[PDB]
Symmetry: D2
Subunit: 114 residues, 4 copies
Amino acid sequence: ATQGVFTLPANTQFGVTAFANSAGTQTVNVQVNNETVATFTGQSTNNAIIGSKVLNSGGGGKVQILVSVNGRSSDLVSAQVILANELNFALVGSEDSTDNDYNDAVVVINWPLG
Amino acid sequence: ATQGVFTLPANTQFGVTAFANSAGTQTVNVQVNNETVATFTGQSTNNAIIGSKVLNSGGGGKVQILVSVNGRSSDLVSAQVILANELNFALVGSEDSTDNDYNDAVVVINWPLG
Amino acid sequence: ATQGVFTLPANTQFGVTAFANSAGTQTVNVQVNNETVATFTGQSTNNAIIGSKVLNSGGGGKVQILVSVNGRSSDLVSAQVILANELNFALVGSEDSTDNDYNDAVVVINWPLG
Amino acid sequence: ATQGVFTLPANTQFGVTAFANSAGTQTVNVQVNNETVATFTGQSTNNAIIGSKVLNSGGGGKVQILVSVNGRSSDLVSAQVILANELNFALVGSEDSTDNDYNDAVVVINWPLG
Ligand SMILES: Cc1cc(C)c(S(=O)(=O)NC[C@H]2O[C@@H](C)[C@@H](O)[C@@H](O)[C@@H]2O)c(C)c1
Ligand SMILES: Cc1cc(C)c(S(=O)(=O)NC[C@H]2O[C@@H](C)[C@@H](O)[C@@H](O)[C@@H]2O)c(C)c1
Ligand SMILES: Cc1cc(C)c(S(=O)(=O)NC[C@H]2O[C@@H](C)[C@@H](O)[C@@H](O)[C@@H]2O)c(C)c1
Ligand SMILES: [Ca+2]
Ligand SMILES: [Ca+2]
Ligand SMILES: [Ca+2]
Ligand SMILES: [Ca+2]
Ligand SMILES: [Ca+2]
Ligand SMILES: [Ca+2]
Ligand SMILES: [Ca+2]
C-alpha cells in the first residue's frame, strides 16, 4: 500500500518533526499538494530531532512524507490516530535496511496548533 | 479512565518529546516507575518543542505523563499505536483552563531507538 | 475528555458492531447527528456480537456511542485510527464495574463500505 | 513491511472478526504460532460479517492474518492500538484489486475477553 500520505483539513497549520535512529544519513522530504515544502537531513542513532517545522496544508490538504538514504528510497509504514475527536497525529516509520525496526527515520505530524 | 500511563518493555530506551500550544506555561512531568525523571517547562502558541530527551523504562517499564499549568492539573487523553508490530508511539494530549483543546501540551513517546 | 464521539465524512455508509464481555446486560446506543438510530442489547462473557448494522452518517457526520448497563452509564475510552489514508476505524471500550478491563461492551465502527 | 502480524500476550483469549466489502469472495486465514486455527470465507459488498471466533494466543503469542481471493494474496495494511493501557485492538485492511479502498476484507482482533 502507499504509505506516508495524509489528508489534512484544508489551509491548516500543522507541525512536522523528524527523528533519526540509524547509521545512515536520513533525507526526509515533506510535500504539500505534490510540492516539496521542507527537507530535513540528518544523522543520529539516538533519536535526535533532525527537523521540526510549522507548515500549512494548503488548499488540497495533501501531506506526503518521503524518506531516502544516499538516494535510495526507504520503505515506509504509517497511520493516523485521532484522540478526543480533535487531536491528530500522522505517524511515519521508515526502514533503510533489513532489521525492520522502522525507526531509521521517524516522522510525527501534529495538528491542530495554537 | 486513567490516561497518560503506558507499559513499555523493561530496560528500554525511549524518546519523549513535548510540544506546546497554549498561552499558559506548561509543566510536563515524566515519571518512570513512579519517580519523576524529567520535567519540561515551556511556553508557546506555535508548537515549539519544550523538551526532548532519551530515557530508559527501567525495571518496571512504567511511564506516566502528567501536565500542569500554574499548578493546576490538565485533563489528559492518550493512546498507544504500534506499526509493523515493532514501532511504538505513546501519545498524550492535554487541556488546560486557557484553551479547551487537547493540544495545549502534546507529548510523543517513541521506541525503539538506535 | 468526552469519549465515543467521532466525526465521519458526511452522508457516508458505515458499519457499527458491538461485542460483549461482562456478566451485565449491555446497551449500546448509536446516535447520528444527535439522534438515536440503533440500539444493541445483549449479554455475553465470551465476546458475542450483540449487534452489527450498516448506517449513514447523515449531513453532519456526527456519530456518538453511549454504553449503559441497566440505566447506569459505563465509563468509555475511544480513539480513531486511519490506515492507508482511507480505511477508518473508530473504536470504543467501556467499563461497567471496577476491574478496569474496559471490554464490557466493545464497539467498532468501520468505513468505507462497498 | 510485513503487515497483519501481531504479538499478543501469551496464553490469552482473543476475538477475531472479519467483514467483507468486495465483489470477490474473501478467504481470511488466522494463524496462531504458525498454525492455521480459523478460516472465514464469504462475500458481501455491505460489510457482512463473514466470521467471528474466540481463539487463544498460545505460548508464543504470534497472530497472523492472511487474506486471499481465489488464492491470490490481498495486499494488507495493519496496526495495533491500545486504549487505557489495557484494551487492545489489532486491525487489518486488505485490498484485492487496485481501487485501494483496503476494505475488501476487514479484520478486527480484540483482547482481553471476559
Ligand atoms: C551509512 C550506512 C551504514 C549502514 C551499515 C547502513 S545499513 O546497515 O543498511 N542500515 C542502517 C542501520 O543503522 C543501524 C545503526 C540501525 O539503526 C539499523 O536499524 C539501521 O537500519 C546504512 C543504511 C547506512
Ligand atoms: C457495579 C457492578 C456492575 C455490574 C455490571 C456488575 S455485573 O454485571 O454483575 N459484572 C460485570 C463484570 O462481569 C465480569 C464477568 C467481568 O466481565 C467484568 O469485567 C465485568 O465488569 C457488578 C457485579 C457490579
Ligand atoms: C485483480 C482483481 C481482483 C478482484 C477480486 C476483482 S473483483 O472481485 O471483480 N472486484 C473486487 C472489487 O469489488 C468492488 C465492488 C469494490 O469493493 C472493490 O474495492 C473491490 O476491490 C477485480 C475486478 C480485479
Ligand atoms: Ca533499520
Ligand atoms: Ca534503526
Ligand atoms: Ca491550545
Ligand atoms: Ca469490566
Ligand atoms: Ca469484562
Ligand atoms: Ca478494493
Ligand atoms: Ca471494497
